[model samples]
Target: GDERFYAEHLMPTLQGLLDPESAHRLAVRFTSLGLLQDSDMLEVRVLGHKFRNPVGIAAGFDKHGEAVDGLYKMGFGFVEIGSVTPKPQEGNPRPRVFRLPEDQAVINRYGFNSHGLSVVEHRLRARQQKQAKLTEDGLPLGVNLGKNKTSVDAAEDYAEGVRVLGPLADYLVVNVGKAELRRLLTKVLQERDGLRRVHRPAVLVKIAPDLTSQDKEDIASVVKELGIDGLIVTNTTVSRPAGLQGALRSETGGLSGKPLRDLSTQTIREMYALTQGRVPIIGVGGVSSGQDALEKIRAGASLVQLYTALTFWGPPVVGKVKRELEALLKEQGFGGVTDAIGADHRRLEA
Candidate 1:
């Protein structure tokens, strides 16, 4: 079925492109053009930042902040750039991003290859200046912080991100990759002690989907104790999907896409229950349609993001999904996206 769809529909229609990275760039560019033309309504507000909509372009899709203006133009409610380190790095070698068409998934071990903070800060500053002059609706922008590959103490790296980009960003998403979760959590808890100490931006953490029950509880505890702004529910999964017979299945990296839907949503539901609505949850993983977005909302996600689905559906997918979600919300008797959050979770045992 996948092969038939690709050959008869996608390949010819899309021009036989195979490189994931390049395709991603092209998709963003296309979406940016669509946004500039006012071809769609993409607006949403979350975490104190007014977004064009709830559908945002997830991190890893724009690791270096190289294309925020273009990405914004593409119709995302917001764009998150970087998983940047303190200094510039090349990241993992080429072949680091692999596609599994059969599963509508991708595996990537980019290892935070980035242009680093200096470049990112400069870009953000320039963008801010430009955005300040625009009168029309503009997308909100966030920064995702990551530890340097060589950092002996990762907390310092995360703290550095907060110290530097926090002021420039509408929001800050700090990620504690699978390897550094415990240490990162400790550091975030420590840093969060003085939330008023930070000058700008809402702060949230991006966690892995593979965390255990204890891990989830630990995170909830920290969130409540520290007064964190929000929770991104998941980053990506390292677990191989069941029956993943694709060639890329063996790749050493985080897996994302359709296969990640159930696990990620379940994590959101669990975290929502644990936090008891104390903290907001931003659901991310495998959303490709309005139904997928609604599912996350019903599961208690205050917002939703996408990456792999963009690969499968292309840039126009943003407007398509938002329109569908709007109709779905109306049909379900919800006033808006925010009204839909946690509606279904009440009946389930988290």
Candidate 2:
């Protein structure tokens, strides 16, 4: 009966009508409707920015900044839009987004496909107008900045991203890949004094999960040395998980989801130890449940984010996980989420 209904009623009507982008937009619209109707707890604050909740839609979902309100309504505490470059780009050709259902992961080599800074700014300006009318207190929105594919100088792109998006965003996430960190360090050091000259939005960096211990130390040292606000402990991973079963496991590009959990969590734990909790860390990788989220919190993450889990579990997962997380904190006798940070590290060191 279920198969007959899906085949006869659902499949034929929905088939051939939706592309990936359209399906994504439709999902956002659906999430907005859910938020409008639900009355469960919906507010969280981090790094001086107030979020509607701790569950946020990670970057790469809305690369051009469209439908932020839709995403916000869907119950995201915040939304990270882009990996935007200064110039418009078509990015790598089709077949770029590959889904591995068995592995609960996605491989995307989209290469920062974006409508560029100028268009993004224009869209954001309009969204700002809508946001102004909505409420005084609303979700935090961030812009994820990236270098253009052909960029010979990566630092220039980082500077350009800050120059353009800094004034408008609640925060700015610098998407600096591991290989490019050293090159961008000089620019970051040079620009540190100038950030105050413009709007002083909370600035953070997004690093890859595949870095070595020395790389983690180097990154932590630079972040502290430059007075950077916080660190997003990971981006996606390029390394293949051992003995992955999916047909798409060999697909090239950054991999994210369940397989990334251990790698990302290990990186977060290492960074937490290296930084000694001096700087806030946003842990993100394969978080799909409250336990996974709490593990990051215990490992020293001030906040956590998700993207792939939503693809597998649907939109309601955010509120569901938040409920469980709150209960978890209460059960553990932690007064608040921050109190649990790095709680497990002392035992490991001993």
Candidate 3:
């Protein structure tokens, strides 16, 4: 065993020197080999279950479900694995992932690169049989499913995921593009409800951050109409804001990091109001600090997720955010994170 590889604490610095994708591969493997705090201060009850904390690693990090246990050990309240496609495929070509250190962001057109559902199912199945536990106790495991690039029917892909991966997941996500969501969700929802698992996994939709007001309204209406369990607000953005620096800034792909912070928060605020605080949202993008997490919670997010920050700060960022968030909650007289959820909306009424 390489000592440096095991010393994952230094990964933030070490990962920087390597290419972005290579760093991701190494980090996942290193964590698979080995690898927060408080109790009730951050406990959150949402999506018909309880999360020890609201901080979770967003989907796409563990694209193949390889490191769920390792990630949980790093203090995340939940871990979302995949955006896994139905069939294995090489995502985009090399140089597909670009890092903009100055902007504290990353651009990747990784086109849903995955080892397919079969590989993921094998892993989950093994874990389920061995310990009768797919993840740490009480921590939720989310499986995010994506369609194959070549697939003509996106709904079938999602339905297949729900049919197969749903039994092993505490919750399942349909990661799809903007249009036809109503049609898509209707089909996938049926597939989810038909699952044989005693604990039928909740279904959530993962949407992009670049939708218009009309689009958001339609999304909220359909979610409420369909009775979807939750929403993972604000996927990576396509828009490139001004003042962004670095050679990779021009790369064509999803942009995530500090650049996406405000955009996601604003989307969360709008969606929460549109749904009238009825739906639970997992606010993600550009979150690296406790203050950032608090902003989303106040804006109406019940839970939050981060990925780009992990590149810069590694897993320790989870604990840091938890500590700061607990303090921020107390400072504001929030009995717990749950009380602060959607507080901004209530403040406006006052």
Candidate 4:
């Protein structure tokens, strides 16, 4: 594939061809065709897993757990799939996702649309069978657990997700905002440890950016108390920035991309301070360049992920970010990747 042609011409054409959602489907369909490939650099390890690079594709991009290897081939050190629910449910109506090319942003209210746990379980199982070994790609495969919109019990839904899919994933993620997170996660850990005799999957909670100070302090206590592996730093924000342009800015959904970068980064710094760097953090939101990726690391992310960059720049964005980040890391005179974590936050007394 000619990088110039794909980036300059084909990507823009694809962006304009289908609606944002349809175009995503069409682009990811090519993932399994082996069109994307990655390069290995200085190896970085987090949470007992070794990553070829610190860059990862975040959740919500491949909600079904499909195209895991395809995404790895595309050069991300890890690819997190899903926000998959206990049962498959139709999300909001068709236009649930709106692209703001002008602002380099996207707003989505895709309320946990999924193909359900069992289907994803089967696919993951089949996919695992073909793998020569666990962590074979030098990339972690994780699933984000989601409660159904109509579910009466969030804990039960989350436990069910962990029970069936836990043994299969490198890690499992549950979104915050519900009250039973402590109890819910207890059930998940028990289930995970009970199912596997060795090397059980890690559990991470994905929280929102709009939590109050008390709320943030409480969850910081919770991760340490619950003994969960890590935090995602945040999900999309309900709060809109003041200067967003375009007609769809008023759409009721979580805003992401450039609009979300600072919010997510701030949240990461907050949690890093709260956790005292004891917890591994995955920074995300509005990351479109190597500098953005490195900023998250300095703010205290051990690993970072991307979603909107793919929507805007296509597969080349993956290579672009990794290449740029590699240069940034080297230029800073840091021969190692994880060493760069939290330099910004630790720069001065707060």
Worst 10 residues of 3 by lDDT: 1-10
Per-residue C-alpha lDDT of model 1 across residues 1-350, encoded as one tens digit per residue: 24346445774466356577667657655544545532223344557666557888889877877777776665677778878888899888887888888888889888888888888888777767665433135466778988888888878888777776766776788864333555665565455444553435777888898888888888887777667788997788999868886777998999999999988999989899889988888899999888998999899888888988767766567777788888888787777887788987765655
Model 3 gets an lDDT of: 0.86
lDDT score, candidate 3, position 242: 91
Stretch of 10 with least lDDT, candidate 2: 35-44
In candidate 2, list every pair of residues with a backbone clash.
31-74
Model 3 bad stretches (over 4 Å): 1-12, 129-136, 177-179
> Candidate 4 local accuracy as lDDT?
0.83
lDDT of 1: 0.76
TM-score of each: 0.86, 0.85, 0.94, 0.94
Query: Against the correct fold, how does model 3 do in TM-score?
Result: 0.94
Per-residue lDDT of 51 in model 2: 55
**Which regions of candidate 4 deviate over 4 angstroms?**
1-4, 37-41, 131-134, 177-179
Ranking by TM-score: 4, 3, 1, 2
Task: Report lDDT per candidate.
Answer: 0.76, 0.74, 0.86, 0.83
lDDT of 3 by residue, 200-247 (tens): 888998888988788889889999999999999889999998999878
For model 4, how does the per-residue alpha-carbon lDDT over 1-350 read when each residue is reduced to its tens digit?
45677767887798778888897776667786666333344467777677778788888988897788788778888878898999999988888988887788989998889999998898888878554253765677888999899999878898899888887878888888435656777887777777753657888988889999889988988899978899997788898898998578899999989999999999999999999989999999889899999999999998889988887677778778888888888888886677789888768666
Model 4 TM: 0.94
